[PDB]
Amino acid sequence: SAAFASDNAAPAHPRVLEALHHVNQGPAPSYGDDPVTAEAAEALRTAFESPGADVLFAFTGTAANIIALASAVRPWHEIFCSDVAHVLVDEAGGPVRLSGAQLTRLASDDGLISPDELERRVRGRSAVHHSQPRIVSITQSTENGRVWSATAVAQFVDRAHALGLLVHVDGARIANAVAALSISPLEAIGDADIVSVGGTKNGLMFGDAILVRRPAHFDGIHFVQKQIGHLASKHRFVAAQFAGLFEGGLWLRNAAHANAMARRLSTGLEALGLQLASPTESNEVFVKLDGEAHRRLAERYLVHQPDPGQPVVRFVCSWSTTETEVDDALAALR
Amino acid sequence: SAAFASDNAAPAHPRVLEALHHVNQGPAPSYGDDPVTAEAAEALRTAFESPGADVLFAFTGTAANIIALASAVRPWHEIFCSDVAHVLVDEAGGPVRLSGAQLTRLASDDGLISPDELERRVRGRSAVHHSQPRIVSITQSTENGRVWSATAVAQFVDRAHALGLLVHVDGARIANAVAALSISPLEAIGDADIVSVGGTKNGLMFGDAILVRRPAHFDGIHFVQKQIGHLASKHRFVAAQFAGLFEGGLWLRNAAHANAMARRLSTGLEALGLQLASPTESNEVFVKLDGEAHRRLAERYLVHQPDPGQPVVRFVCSWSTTETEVDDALAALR
Amino acid sequence: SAAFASDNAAPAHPRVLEALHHVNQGPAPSYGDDPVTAEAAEALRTAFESPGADVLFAFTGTAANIIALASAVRPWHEIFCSDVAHVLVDEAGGPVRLSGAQLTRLASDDGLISPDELERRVRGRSAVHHSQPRIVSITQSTENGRVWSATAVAQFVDRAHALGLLVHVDGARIANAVAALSISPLEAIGDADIVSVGGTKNGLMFGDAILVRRPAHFDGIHFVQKQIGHLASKHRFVAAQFAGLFEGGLWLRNAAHANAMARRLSTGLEALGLQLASPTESNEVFVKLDGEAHRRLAERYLVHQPDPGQPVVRFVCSWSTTETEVDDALAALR
Amino acid sequence: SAAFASDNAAPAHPRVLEALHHVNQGPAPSYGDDPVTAEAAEALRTAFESPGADVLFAFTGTAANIIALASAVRPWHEIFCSDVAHVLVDEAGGPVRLSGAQLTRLASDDGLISPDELERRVRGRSAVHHSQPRIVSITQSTENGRVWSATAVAQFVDRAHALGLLVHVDGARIANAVAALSISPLEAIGDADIVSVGGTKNGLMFGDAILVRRPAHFDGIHFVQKQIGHLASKHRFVAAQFAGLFEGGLWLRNAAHANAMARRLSTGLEALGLQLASPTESNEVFVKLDGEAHRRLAERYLVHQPDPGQPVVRFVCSWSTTETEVDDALAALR
């Protein structure tokens, strides 16, 4: 079963399909010049309290990240990210291929990067022989299931800005961080210049948006989107998914349920005597499992081992995860 | 009204939305490792009588073309296309950016390229100082609304193959060519090596497939797809659309209706005394209209002028175009 | 014999070797941070009466062209050139690979492009779906041995600027144009924004400079130079070559001699009854030769056939070409 | 004074100028189709006891590295290097920009990488979502002035080969490693697949070669060289430099002298009570200096500080360094 393989193993929320049906009549001008796209863009700007932002819509989170970062840099610039960042490990090098720029990893505590580590790797890089530090990407919630605190994300973004850098937030799971912290979306991303806003993992069929809070720094981003095939002609159907998910606060209720199920699973794993590899602050559970328990669990449940050198497996819960599924996975581990 | 702006102005066929609902239950392994993807791939292999083909699915036709062409070449190779090709004029240079290779236009008659024109531009290019001819892209039906005959597409592909070149077919509107010619899909592509198979324009919500008839020549195509963000995690939803549209020949009924409405419009405007710029062989009608007549028509219908140096406007008919819409367009053109 | 293969088949001028010896003592700060580089940069600025220009030095004419054009554009821009341009046909697509941008050929008369042809191919290209016209490259003297007149080059540059475009001049053979026209270097380039200044073909050992007349439009050009390996550590030796060749106008005397030998050859060929393919306005002679005569000439002289479909061969004369070599070639053609 | 800024601050050896003069007569076929290029290539193959190798010549060491690595990979592959590698820190990201591939740093001891560290970072990287490990670059002697022992380089290359990876050696200072170890050049590179062979730093004017020991793995390398402007038309002059430097062991005498001066300087610094940051095994001396002493030395000697966060400065000795220069630097530090 793929019930815990990823939150992208989940189906789509019925309200998303309903939104697709609602816009499925009559002709519509293509490529985003339609009222549904305008409505969805305004919904995202309002949610993040960023009335001056531009909003683009891509089909995957990989695409959202590549478009944001490649529009931020020239090839002789330098991009920074954590040592567990999706852009670094799970996009087959897409960001580097499109940007032409080096992607420099930073030591992190489960994705949480110290401002001092960034400062150390940016210092003294002004010669023509050096890639030029330009933008740092962080992830919220992180790829190891942690959440940046309101204070920590504000301090990191402010410190990066003081160094003359831009900040990108990979919010493929931003809804899970917002629900976990009970703060505003804007507080959860901390004055970032650009944000990949995840939809796919939170109940869409597909779709990951780009909130460009400071458009002056990303000139040409719409051309970059076009050049990699992510400007949809039938754009009403990507936009309608976001409208349906954000209608009435549904997106944060979806993420809160995913988080609650992850908490149930994590508590159950600890009750079995197992050790968490990372604290369950979001909708992802990382647990230490020996080889045979892993292979026995794998006969019933598909789970990811993010690091081949560490006996740690990952469970991910979604908007559609049930208490019965959690308890059945735990029974499988016993 | 956008009723004739493009076939991508049309909504999605009801069977497509039904297919989305049918696969929207339970968790599913992601990134194409699911039975619906396997079913859709087999539907495409069967339609094109290509049992040895691999099948990939991208979100747009631009993406399909970029993935096919960039996977065929190294940066020092040379790609050829017609002087009206979508890859040349309407993808913001995406194919060139991703492949790293020069894209060389060939003189054509409404997209129909002579084999001799290709051969002339391929001759004598073997020195280290020259981009190395590798693949030619043709479009079926063409961007100017013409269809390559079965004989013509076979001679062109045969000439390219005799010269050692690969052939890509941009079949964004392959269903319209097949319906117009009443030949098999394989006959309509003439032994080509790779084909972008259009879905969006023929009634899907999103989705354009890549039929790789000779996989040995496109090593790494799956990495190219991943690197530009076109490997969907919830792949069951792109696949379900293709399975539904190809079930029982629906795709060709959609295209036949679009072609028939184009016939009604084309013959009707000729009856008005207006003149065609190109023969209506598919679902696109190109009509000579001066600037003032165009501005008067633009008050009721959005239509594109593909060439700013030519007083020619384009109407496109779709699976959902009605006789009432065609006749109202004729009343506006009168 | 390679006497007429190219002007880059010639040796290096004695003054160039003397200049290399002159700077070959003691340690010197690297990467251009030395007085010889400053002296050479000033010599080039003075020759082209461009006191506000920046000057870079690269190792080949291909490199000079790539650095200039790639620094001018983003990947979604569009570069224009003539249908015989070196950047198009003889750099294995280097400019396209490094810039990421489409290179669009323009019909020309032996490299001389009409302003109207540029204007036609730039019109109406403002949509997100289109590569964005940015810079046109012309060649002076052209790859077919013609010279842009002072009036023609000024008018072409003025039209390109009125269209919002930049202009690059590939002056791999700028010295020959200047000597042929008896005008100033600045008049021969017509207020262009960036110029590749040829040294190699006019008697250097290696070296081709970039005169950046409007640096604001080429931000990052020094990083582009560094990134492709064309920032010499021992920069005193590239600079010394240029200083020696330009001292006292030697560069123009070298080119005038090359042009005079080309005229001797061209008129002698016409006296033999042969027909020129292009008028000999510079140091290159293009002559029609049947297959029979060509395969003979090839046993005694290496000559280039630029177009495989046309019975045309090219002779190139250099600063070191002698009247005896010219007359012996003419005697071989009897 | 630039006496210790770098070995590329040194002038050119007299034998190099003699070689340039010797080949400077008559016309010569261009782009490497001359006997001097053949002679130089044979000299390099003989020095490295690699009769099956192909040999290319570029103008800089940055270019040599970029051409070797970019020809080894497709964009979805992964390149590895040490955390102090020139390709990583001092080429403005050129290798990444050309290859399109991620460049992954490995923890090292002054550039000496443990085989286990490579193996750890290569493990489990087979999914479509991952950059695909392909080639590791090591440097000999290293950027921190250390030499790989014969045993260590052989074990590292064998370990890499068993993992299915290629090995590139940046031998910008290979002559210094060979002289320090008193082993053969081939033993000093340990069966590597491709080697950048430094000439510039060992007394040439310009020029750094590529020894392609296994050409089957670098298909298209000559096109890559052409595309970044590093195929010299007047190729006889780069080839003549290499032939002159390698005749009769001159290159190793130059390197042995540079190493001897580095030893004099290093022993002198230790005698002053100063502390080395790295052991002086080659021609580079890395010494800890507090701010006061560094500021006084910088008024008198130009020296590099490789890490802005460490109070460590670098002296480099060359073929032309004299005992007087070393002793005066030591006296200045007093």
Automatic annotation (TrEMBL), chains A, B, C, D:
Q: What Enzyme Commission number(s) apply to this enzyme?
A: 4.1.2.5
| The protein's required cofactors | pyridoxal 5'-phosphate
GO terms, biological process = amino acid metabolic process
Q: Protein name, please?
A: L-threonine aldolase
| Coiled coil region boundaries | none
Q: What family classification does the UniProt entry report for this protein?
A: Belongs to the threonine aldolase family.
Q: InterPro entries in the record, alphabetically?
A: ArAA_b-elim_lyase/Thr_aldolase, PyrdxlP-dep_Trfase, PyrdxlP-dep_Trfase_major, PyrdxlP-dep_Trfase_small
Q: Enumerate the Pfam families for this protein.
A: Beta_elim_lyase
Which superkingdom is the protein from?
Answer: Bacteria
Instruction: Give every Aromatic amino acid beta-eliminating lyase/threonine aldolase domain span.
Output: 4-290
In alphabetical order, the GO MF annotations are: threonine aldolase activity
Q: Which organism is it from?
A: Mycolicibacterium vanbaalenii (strain DSM 7251 / JCM 13017 / BCRC 16820 / KCTC 9966 / NRRL B-24157 / PYR-1) (Mycobacterium vanbaalenii)
Q: Does the keyword Lyase apply?
A: yes
| Biological classification of the source | Bacteria, Bacillati, Actinomycetota, Actinomycetes, Mycobacteriales
Entry keyword set: Lyase, Pyridoxal phosphate
